[PDB]
């Protein structure tokens, strides 16, 4: 877990997709609703775990889809986006 | 890691298949390997990592596709397959 969404690269935030994805499966939800939590906060999308659970049908339904939709609004925002790298 | 595909439900099984493709995605390939190395070690199916890299086209290229075909390689090999849960 890193404070921003700037301290991501993308791949490492395709990493924290995968753990959302393992956490989806786990015996509880304690784990899954922090890693929630987080996904929500340095995101800031409108849609929050939708894009997880309801992506758009425009859209590719997979983590590097994901991190598309979430470049895209950022930058039609004006808010900085991810750590090259 | 668990010693044995006894020792893992279905679903614990397919958080390991979670955590490979996480390290899929990692900087270096350190944990992926031993994490392979115990796939292989555990499972005893002839093709090794091909259920994840090369799946059969007549079967589903998913987590759960993966435990469906080793849980049938077993079965029809006399081994003991999952535990129950």
Redesign the interface.
């Known amino acids: 877990l890193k404070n921003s969404i700037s301290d991501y690269t993308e ?1 490492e935030f ?2 924290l997709l ?2 959302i ?2 956490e989806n ?3 509880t939800d304690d784990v899954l609703d922090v890693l929630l939590e987080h996904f929500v906060k340095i995101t800031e999308h409108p849609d929050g775990t939708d894009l997880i659970y309801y992506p758009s049908d425009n859209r590719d339904d997979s983590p590097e889809g994901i991190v598309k939709e979430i470049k895209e609004w950022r930058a039609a925002n004006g808010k900085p986006g991810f750590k090259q790298g």
Chains 1, 2 share one sequence.
């Open positions: 791949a395709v990493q995968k753990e994805e393992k499966v786990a015996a």
